Curated annotation (Swiss-Prot), chain A:
Assembly and oligomerization: Component of the large ribosomal subunit (LSU). Mature yeast ribosomes consist of a small (40S) and a large (60S) subunit. The 40S small subunit contains 1 molecule of ribosomal RNA (18S rRNA) and 33 different proteins (encoded by 57 genes). The large 60S subunit contains 3 rRNA molecules (25S, 5.8S and 5S rRNA) and 46 different proteins (encoded by 81 genes). uL4 is associated with the polypeptide exit tunnel. uL4 interacts with its chaperone ACL4 and the nuclear import receptor KAP104.
Annotated family: Belongs to the universal ribosomal protein uL4 family.
Localization terms from the record: Cytoplasm; Nucleus
UniProt PTM comment: N-terminally acetylated by acetyltransferase NatA.
Stated role: Component of the ribosome, a large ribonucleoprotein complex responsible for the synthesis of proteins in the cell. The small ribosomal subunit (SSU) binds messenger RNAs (mRNAs) and translates the encoded message by selecting cognate aminoacyl-transfer RNA (tRNA) molecules. The large subunit (LSU) contains the ribosomal catalytic site termed the peptidyl transferase center (PTC), which catalyzes the formation of peptide bonds, thereby polymerizing the amino acids delivered by tRNAs into a polypeptide chain.
Organism lineage string: Eukaryota, Fungi, Dikarya, Ascomycota, Saccharomycotina
Miscellaneous comment text of the record: There are 2 genes for uL4 in yeast.
Domain of life: Eukaryota
Swiss-Prot record, chain B:
Family listed: Belongs to the eukaryotic ribosomal protein eL21 family.
UniProt subunit comment: Component of the large ribosomal subunit (LSU). Mature yeast ribosomes consist of a small (40S) and a large (60S) subunit. The 40S small subunit contains 1 molecule of ribosomal RNA (18S rRNA) and 33 different proteins (encoded by 57 genes). The large 60S subunit contains 3 rRNA molecules (25S, 5.8S and 5S rRNA) and 46 different proteins (encoded by 81 genes).
Function: Component of the ribosome, a large ribonucleoprotein complex responsible for the synthesis of proteins in the cell. The small ribosomal subunit (SSU) binds messenger RNAs (mRNAs) and translates the encoded message by selecting cognate aminoacyl-transfer RNA (tRNA) molecules. The large subunit (LSU) contains the ribosomal catalytic site termed the peptidyl transferase center (PTC), which catalyzes the formation of peptide bonds, thereby polymerizing the amino acids delivered by tRNAs into a polypeptide chain.
This protein's encoding gene: RPL21A
Disulphide bridges: none
Superkingdom of this protein's organism: Eukaryota
Subcellular location: Cytoplasm
Protein name as annotated: Large ribosomal subunit protein eL21A
Residues of the full protein shown: 39 to 153 of 160
Note: There are 2 genes for eL21 in yeast.
Curated annotation (Swiss-Prot), chain C:
GO CC field: cytosol; cytosolic large ribosomal subunit
Native organism: Saccharomyces cerevisiae (strain ATCC 204508 / S288c) (Baker's yeast)
Keywords annotated in UniProt: Cytoplasm, Isopeptide bond, Methylation, Ribonucleoprotein, Ribosomal protein, Ubl conjugation
Subunit structure comment from the entry: Component of the large ribosomal subunit (LSU). Mature yeast ribosomes consist of a small (40S) and a large (60S) subunit. The 40S small subunit contains 1 molecule of ribosomal RNA (18S rRNA) and 33 different proteins (encoded by 57 genes). The large 60S subunit contains 3 rRNA molecules (25S, 5.8S and 5S rRNA) and 46 different proteins (encoded by 81 genes). eL18 interacts with NAP1.
Subcellular location, record wording: Cytoplasm
Similarity comment: family membership: Belongs to the eukaryotic ribosomal protein eL18 family.
Task performed by this protein: Component of the ribosome, a large ribonucleoprotein complex responsible for the synthesis of proteins in the cell. The small ribosomal subunit (SSU) binds messenger RNAs (mRNAs) and translates the encoded message by selecting cognate aminoacyl-transfer RNA (tRNA) molecules. The large subunit (LSU) contains the ribosomal catalytic site termed the peptidyl transferase center (PTC), which catalyzes the formation of peptide bonds, thereby polymerizing the amino acids delivered by tRNAs into a polypeptide chain.
Name the UniProt record assigns to this protein: Large ribosomal subunit protein eL18A
Shown residues within the full chain: 3 to 148 of 186
Curated annotation (Swiss-Prot), chain D:
PANTHER family assigned: 60S RIBOSOMAL PROTEIN L18A
UniProt feature coiled coil, ranges: none
Disulfide bridges in this chain: none
Species lineage: Eukaryota, Fungi, Dikarya, Ascomycota, Saccharomycotina
Organism: Saccharomyces cerevisiae (strain ATCC 204508 / S288c) (Baker's yeast)
Protein's UniProt name: Large ribosomal subunit protein eL20A
Note: Present with 54300 molecules/cell in log phase SD medium.
Residues where Phosphoserine is found: 31
Cellular localisation: Cytoplasm
The encoding gene: RPL20A
Amino acid sequence: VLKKNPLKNKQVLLRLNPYAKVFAAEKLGSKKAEKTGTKPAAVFTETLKHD
Amino acid sequence: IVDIKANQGKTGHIKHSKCRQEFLERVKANAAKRAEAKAQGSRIVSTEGNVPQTLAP
Amino acid sequence: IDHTSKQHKRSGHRTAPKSDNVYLKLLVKLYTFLARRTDAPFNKVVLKALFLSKINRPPVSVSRIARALKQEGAANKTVVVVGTVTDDARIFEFPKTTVAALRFTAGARAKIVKAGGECITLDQLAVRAPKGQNTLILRGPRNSRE
Amino acid sequence: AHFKEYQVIGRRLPTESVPEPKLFRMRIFASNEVIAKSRYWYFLQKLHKVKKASGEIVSINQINEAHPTKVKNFGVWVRYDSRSGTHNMYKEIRDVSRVAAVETLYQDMAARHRARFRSIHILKVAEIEKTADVKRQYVKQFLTKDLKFPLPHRVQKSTKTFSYKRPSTFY
Amino acid sequence: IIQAKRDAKAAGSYYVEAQHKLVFVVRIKGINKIPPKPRKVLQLLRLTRINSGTFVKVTKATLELLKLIEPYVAYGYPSYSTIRQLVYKRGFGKINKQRVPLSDNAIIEANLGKYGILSIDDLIHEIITVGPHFKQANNFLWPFKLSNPSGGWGVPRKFKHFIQGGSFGNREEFINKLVKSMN
RNA sequence: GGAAUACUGCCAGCUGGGACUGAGGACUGCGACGUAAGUCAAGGAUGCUGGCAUAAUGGUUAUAUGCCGCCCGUCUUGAAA
RNA sequence: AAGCUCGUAUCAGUUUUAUGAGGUAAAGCGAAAACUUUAAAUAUGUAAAAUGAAGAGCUUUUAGUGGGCCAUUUUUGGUAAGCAGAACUGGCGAUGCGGGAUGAACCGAACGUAGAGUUAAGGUGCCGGAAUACACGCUCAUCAGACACCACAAAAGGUGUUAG
RNA sequence: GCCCUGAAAAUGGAUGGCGCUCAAGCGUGUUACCUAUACUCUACCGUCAGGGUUGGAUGCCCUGACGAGUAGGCAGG
């Protein structure tokens, strides 16, 4: 009889998506990524900083 | 069905029509492909010898 | 709001016959129920026939009935006419048969009974063959009305 | 808008028996990358008849100012169109970044020559390393030793409708 | 994708990104004084009222259609968050020619089960990855009835190109901000 | 050489204030929390409290104030006069 | 409107694919622009992938209708200048509502009765709802300007001012 | 580029008026704000449509979408 927004109503959210619980519990919205130390090539740096 | 154009492109200064040659060829080709099937059924730009070049007005 | 089709467009199918015959309305009610609760196309055909006008329900002759029964495998089927069965003096021999119709003229009824059959109404037809089993529903010639 | 500088590198559309196209690069001042790409296609076609379908943008980067808080004299070469023919202009702009200087130039063009962003083409922006190489006096004026000037007639902002004293314009 | 860009930088190559396959289009103008060919293309894209949006798969044919309807639409490349919010809040299924809200996974399973779509997130996956059953899933989705943007259009006059300070045309990744304002 | 910050984006992160609405009417559904019992914000508002019980609310009417509103019908021509 | 038929029907004021068209001169590269092979598509046809569509085809029937005005685009012929003849497509007619102070053809948007929110076009000194906002420049008119303008007076004149 | 001249008569009058001059003018940029019978959401009325109904059926229940109008057409009062 009444449409409820899953983006506001947490019960409807869980009803439509059982994975919302795991997402919230493990904080997949704030996943800290693994680091890399790759550096751009000197030709790339010169082209970026050239006219 | 034929072509009309003085030596402006009327379909239906004349030559024979070729407006269904592709359709006929595709009909025959799809028949042959069906017989064949029934019998047995982001690029990358690198810079080694090219560099970006500053060419502006 | 930029409509691609007509708004408030009526479908076109029928619900009430223009006739105010109470018995015809009762038959229509019975066959509306039957075509709803039964997935037999015969009941839908009979229901649709129950709405046609007089000019669209031409009579069916006993000669036409007998010729229809002359088909092989169709001798023991019950013939259904949603309309009037008229007599025909051009036939001198009539088979034994069971006919369901809205109306029988006196001559046609006498001929069927004398040949040894029975004349039943469409509600008796509904009781006997609820899905219209072993039926042969006939329509009379039309272009005769010009 | 608030301008950014983008390096844009494009090339011809690769085809069969056609390797290694001419990598055309440009520096575009624009509010965002969509406008920068459109401007790049426009300038590419003007330079040479290369349609958007006949080309492909292989790179676009944002170039930040290297020393963003150092005051720099910039010489800017531009050309712009009008009802008359295209004109070439040289201007001197004293600012801390190329994007700031380019925004100043666009506003000055709109105010003086009634020109617009679609009419101005920025040929070159370059820092003038030596003081002596400047030409325009409205820039050379701010380059003197121990520069000092007052700000006469200070007009203070009032929040309320009525003030209960006459205002002073002192500074 | 991120690591491929970094590898191209490190090797000195230029990582040319994959061509976009999905576009979200919103009808921007009203239903008065539209020329017949553009209004025919709008009806074919199911954009029959202002602030109505649909997903479109990108091919040559759809590209030419978008070129035709350019003055009357704002379109761009939708992100996963935008698609997810659109489907969750304003997703309606066309079921027996009726507009039915997507309030449960059973509604989606009963009608798209033939294609292997079992839930709202499977439908979103089929949209974001323009998949084998994209036509069926996209047509199952009822055209999105968006409101006017909360915060306005950000321009004084909408009916210029986005490039020239207007609203219409291809705005690429800015469609996400616009559509989230309109959601 | 090591950071920080800006900007852009994401969170099925948290939390405060305001406004309009409360359709439906035994139960049935999909879920959430619980070892269970069961409870819940999960197929649409309930709980607690006060004043009044009449011109108090409201209706009608006359006026005032703010904004709006050209005199009807016919007949002509695209159209208006 | 009524019948008959069917509805994995039948299509489409749309795109694409293959087949044509002013070959007009920018292909590039040829036997010394005179050659004669190609190419993104402005702009129509035929026939077969995209997108959309629950109504379609046929046969009998019934009413009202039988002028045009304005504009865009292309085209042919013209004048001092206006322009005239065609074809297409829109607007208006039968049409209320927001805006342009006002209004046949301008800009938005088409309409059941209400509530809340957001907007279009247009605006935000006061009339008058909304910044006498912020920022960079220009201008001082002895009747400035606040516009119809990629129009007429308009070809120029000036010891006004600014930037080139 | 802006400014002055670049001709114009005759009742008193018009950027709509007031008035405005680092504008309340002109060019341009960035925001905020105002409000249509338009858009979103809800309630209600009607029309149409699709499902269900053997236990006022010209009804009853569930659901969805729509609502400008002259001549004219059809229906209910």
